[PDB]
Point group: C6
Chain length 323, copies 6
């Protein structure tokens, strides 16, 4: 069937390779050395002959690229153009100086040009590196993930036993704090017989304890809401929503309201209460919420969310809310 | 008259068989062995050479299909196209990677293609098997359906008598819990002299006690609201609405507010209170509810619903709300 | 003037006869025997060779039509097609499987086809028979219409004296309970010098005690609201609104608010209070109500409605609300 | 200048007489005898060979017209067409069976045709006779207008003096009660030095005490709001708004809120309180009121209206609300 | 530069003169004698051979123009046509019988024609004469502007010292009461070093104590809001808003909310509190206010307005609100 | 690489210089002497042969330009056109008499022409000079910036330490008070290791303590919301939003609600409380805020804003709100 399968994919593969190879070459040329670096979370070029890399230890390390032709205005613009085209977009110095796209393997990219940047010779690029490593929960415990807590042994038992039972857990905190890395490690305590369905923007979640699952990805014309809606027609036991953002908020609400089994999700929020308040906000941005009261929404989540885990800028839990 | 009926149906039957036979063959070809299985509730192929089946006992059973040509990419894709075309739709790797359709006999089907799936060689399919068996209420009793209740004899008498009198009953719980199977066995206590009108998507309700009845089905351009609206112009005694979903919620509301006799329906809700809240929500998503207060809607349902029955994940009633 | 009047109507009559005669023949062919039956309220064909008739005594009587060619698929489809065309509509197995229309003399008809009905050989038809008989109030008294009341002689005097004075009365209850038949009998106590204007969908109201009146009928492009609005420009003493349904609700509201004389109307409602609540609902579905509070509407009707009469399924008054 | 004025008006007069004379003849032909009658308030033909006239004493008088060619269907229809065309409209048995128009001299006219009327041979017409007579306030006093009041001398002094000072007065009650006739006689107490601007549909208000004034009439594309808006740009002292209807309500509100001197108007309301509620309602039907609370609107009118006068069906004041 | 400047304006001047001269001649012909009159505030022609002039002493003085050809229908229509054209409008007896325009020097004009006026030979015209005289504050004091006050010397010191400091003052009252004349006189107490920017419809404000200022005027396609918005980009010390009316209300609100320096404005209102209520009303008519509460708006103005001055119909202050 | 960079920029530079040089000459020609002046904040020409300059000490200084050809009407008009064309706009005496644009180096410019100005020979121009100087925090201290406070040493320590920790600070006051100059000097206390991203209209913020940063500018089709939205996809540590205006308010809100690190911004508000109210207002003008309560928005900001600093018209802090 492989031979017969190769002829089946021949046309579609060919079309991707023609569109992606120019971008694979430009990406390696400019950022190969940096994308090879260990424990990095972001790479940024500020348009001034210096590349800034952000380590997981919260430190920014600059690199001089003054003597490289890859950081020549014409090479940078080629790269930008390869990025836009890959996602069927355009980037120019008029109606499209800001561009959102992805590299060949999925990492998100943000490019800005003149007139939006300070001047003529300044091109701005920033790439976000996905969570590509899985640390076992045991590791978190050893690194003292729960030490800033008063009920350390109570937190560690609520998480493990809570998720085994299928409670709706939310992991929140600021960017690059470890939310995605954390939800991944706790998937250990989901029974191995559970059917799991994930909704992501970029492949990050790995399945090492489950054989019955399906990954769903959004982008371009397929929204997050589309996937979630499709997900409900695919009989899941658990639903892992990569991260909440906007209108998906409301659709998420109803999924908890139909009394559905254990949902895992990440979200940007400063604390438990800022979360319950943030869930109501994002939820109002979606049409089918107009006739619903803000207090009605906040009181809903507070009744459906079984536990919230917040993480500070030092990658440690400093609040373990439980209902 | 059968000779004349046959010539009357000649053109429509020919058009359906032309469009449905490519589908019947492909469906048999891939899932014939699985659709023959007993006591199943779902069939899922996760695009990785294994077919997962969900049994009524809540267990998933994997089946290896590595040495089958039916699960070859070209054969799967032929099946997907046959699924789309049957419902006058299209499925492709661009603007239509997600598809909702039905098999020849009604079972709902969900298909996802790349770029939404994880990759190029991954096609995801999931089929939902309808409630095709009728178990007599006596059977539920014997299986200990009400054993988890403090008022067992009181519940069993509220149901039998309540429904004989024509009270508005609702059965909620999660997917595959047995709500449809339950409302079916309960129809025994509806007087045989009652005209019954049902509204379903897939044929599931059988009539073994009633001779005066009409079934209405929705799909495509015909909404559930449409059938409900036609229903009211058909003079029913009882109305069985297969399952509440979005906009129908509000039309449902009015039918209760007009004093109408015993309505029976199913809903996805975690509990009595979550139901009263859920009915208010879905009811707000429909236009002619704009000027209505959420508190007005929730209390309206509370006064009109005579009794709610919730079912856990073990197929047992764990709450018998009565007004 | 009759000769000169016949030539005036010649063209319009001819056009109706060409359109209505095919329907007069098809109607007699299939349902003549049933439309001749005494004390019936509805006739239904479920598409299974049996015609069900509903008696005023609440009993359904089946009739076997297995040996009739009028109930042949081709004869049934002809009938359906004659119904649609008469109201300038279309009925088919695609975008128009549900049809609402009327027979030649006004009775409302509801036809449903495949794919909405269960299958290929099932055509559903249901005809509602209008109130065509007038029972004198005395009759209601003799049949014990008010016996289930604690203040029987008080009810009988409030109705008679109340309507003589011109109070806003509402008759409510479920379908086929006798609301229309009741409002008709009480018209006896409206002074014979009153100018009366009725708004109906189907001619049912007769005038045996009044000489100064005008009947108004709605349908197709002329809504109920249109008639009511026209009615207010025709100087009425009393207004008899056949039955409240939707947007007419609000227009009805203002008619009571301008402090207008005695209005009679029927409505589907389970009880007094469900009525005041139902009047507010229907009233919000009409645009010019957006800026009005639900409590503002309910409190209005409660101040303008002078008495409500509710009727149960046994055709007896079981609640006589008075303000 | 009259010779030059005549040539200036030649083309417009010719165009009006061409369009109005077919109407003057048909109107004379059918209703000449009835429009000559004294003390009438309405003329109705119910399509059944009888013309009903409503006298100021509240009695209806029938007149047999069975042997008149004017009430022949073709002659009635000619009259209807002449009515429609005069106001650049159309009347037919399809999309325009209901017509609102005016006779040559202004009287409003309402015409209804089949299918809206009961049948083919039924044409309904109703004509409203304007307040064409002025009775001096002294006459109202002599007829016992205020005899139903506890504070007779106090009412009669509040009116005379109140209006002399310029307070905002409203006259309400039902159709044909005498509100317009009342506000007319009351104008006696408005100082003769006041510039008065009126807004009517039909000419009814006469000026026997004032020399500085301008009349504004609305109809067709010119709304009441239009005239009110122009009015404010004409520097009035007093404003007489013939009668409040829909949207004008809100524009009316603002005029009171700007401190403007004594406004006089008529409204259809059952009582003082029903008026304050009715003004809030009609005021909400106009856009620029969306963001205004119903309680805000009701209280606004209460503080601004200086005195309301209600009139029963016997043409007597039965409530004299003063602030 | 004057010679070079004349050639620069040659084309635009020529175009205005061709459009304005016909109107300069028609205006002098009909109203020259009246526009020359001293202390007048309005001139009105009611279409009945009499011109009414309104003196500042509140008296209307009629003038007979029966023997003038300028008041011939053809001369009046020429004048009307010259007015419409000047503002690029049209005036006729169909879709444009109401016209708002201005004479050559700015005065506002309102013309109404048949069918809106009573009849065929009646043309209505009304011209408002702008405040063209500046009385020094001392004069107001001598005429006893503050005598009806209990704290006369307190009022006179609050106004003088308050405006010197830059407090937000509002002058209100009815038309022709002296609001504009009053704000003009108090500009004496604005420090002469202040940059002043006015927003007017008609030039009325004079600058006799300030050298650094710019006048802004609205009309046609340039709204009041446009000017105010432009004004905020022209670094003003004080802002004098000729008069508040509608949507400008809200824009005005924000200008006070950004904590901006001393604003002077006039408004039509019966009293202090009617003003705070009127400011909230007009403010809601502007889109960007939808999500703001009426009580939220009223409480805002009440916190930002430092003092209100109301004037009665005798040109005297009868209420001096201070916060 | 500079040779290749030059050829890469050849076409864009040529296009800008073609469009910008006519502007550089005209600008030099009229305002060269004034743009060279020290410590100015605005330049205004009021169309009357005098140029007004506003000095940092709040004084306006007039300069006579009567004998200059640059202020000739044709030369001023050439300059206006050059201003409009540079920003792809048009300025004329019809539909575009008001213009908002910028000079060659960024300074904002506002131009008004007749009919908006008082007359034909009057062209109004006003130029805003950007904060182009950086004064060290120590300088503010020496000038007595905090001397008007009761808690001087407490304010000076809350600022230094507060900002070092990353609290959300806001600087408000009126135009030209020194908010931008203040936030600039305060950046000293932001750790040098922080990645800073700024959003301005005109380049004003300098970076003398930070090496990792990116500037974003908005104008034309690129909104402030756009840059803020791109900003969040660039991984900043601190975000400096030049100044809050309309819609950005709400996007700003969310950024605070996501727990994001220390944001610094400027706003036009009279005081702390006026700010919290002002943030709620501007935030409501943006769509996705519809379903949010004004009280919900005001309290949201209060909990998230860590400290507000207001500045009077003498360039001194007169209120130091801390949470
Ligand atoms: N009480 C029961 N005992 C054994 N099997 C059951 C029972 N109730 C339902 N089932 C089986 O479980 C499956 C799911 O039931 P169904 O009524 O369709 O669920 P729901 O509508 O709530 O998703 C069916 O195939 C049915 O035959
Ligand atoms: N006080 C009165 N006495 C006798 N006749 C009256 C009196 N008031 C009104 N009428 C007559 O009654 C009719 C209706 O009066 P009108 O003022 O037009 O009523 P409304 O505007 O309230 O409908 C008129 O023809 C008028 O001449
Ligand atoms: N104090 C005063 N004494 C005499 N005449 C005045 C006085 N104040 C105003 N007037 C005159 O009265 C008229 C009132 O108009 P105006 O001042 O513009 O008031 P508003 O804007 O409120 O209509 C003007 O023609 C003005 O010249
Ligand atoms: N504390 C200060 N002392 C002296 N001059 C100042 C001070 N603060 C600001 N300035 C000057 O005043 C002008 C306006 O300051 P700026 O920060 O741009 O105001 P804002 O943004 O609030 O309008 C600038 O030209 C600046 O150089």
């Amino acid at each position: 069937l492989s031979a017969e399968d190769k002829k089946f994919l021949e046309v579609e593969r060919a079309l991707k390779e023609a569109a992606l190879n120019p971008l694979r070459h430009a990406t390696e040329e400019l950022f190969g050395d940096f994308l090879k670096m260990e424990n990095i979370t972001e790479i940024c070029y500020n348009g001034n002959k210096v590349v800034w890399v952000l380590k997981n230890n919260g430190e920014w390390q600059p690199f001089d690229v003054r003597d490289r032709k890859a950081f020549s205005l014409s090479r940078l613009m080629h790269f930008a153009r390869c990025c836009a085209s890959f996602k069927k977009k355009t980037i120019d110095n008029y109606e499209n100086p800001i561009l959102s796209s992805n590299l060949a393997n999925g990492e998100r990219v943000q490019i800005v040009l003149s007139p939006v940047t300070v001047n003529d010779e300044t091109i701005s690029i920033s790439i976000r590196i996905p969570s590509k490593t899985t640390y076992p929960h045991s590791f978190f415990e050893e690194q003292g993930f729960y030490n800033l807590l008063d009920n350390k042994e109570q937190a560690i038992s609520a998480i493990k036993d809570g998720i085994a039972i299928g409670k709706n857990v939310i992991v929140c905190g600021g960017t690059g704090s470890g939310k995605t890395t954390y939800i991944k490690s706790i998937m250990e305590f989901i029974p191995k017989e559970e059917r799991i369905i994930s909704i992501e923007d970029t492949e990050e979640i790995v399945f090492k304890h489950h054989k019955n699952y399906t990954q769903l990805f959004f982008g371009g014309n397929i929204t997050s809401a589309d996937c979630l809606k499709s997900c409900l027609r695919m009989r899941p036991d658990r639903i892992i929503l990569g991260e909440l953002r906007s209108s998906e908020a409301y659709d998420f609400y109803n999924v908890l309201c139909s009394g559905h089994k254990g949902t895992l999700t990440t979200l940007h929020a400063g604390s438990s209460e800022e979360a319950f308040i943030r869930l109501a906000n994002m939820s109002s941005s979606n049409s089918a919420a107009r006739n619903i009261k803000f207090e009605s929404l906040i009181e809903g989540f507070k009744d459906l969310i079984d536990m919230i885990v917040h993480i500070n800028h030092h990658k440690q839990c400093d609040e373990f809310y439980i209902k």
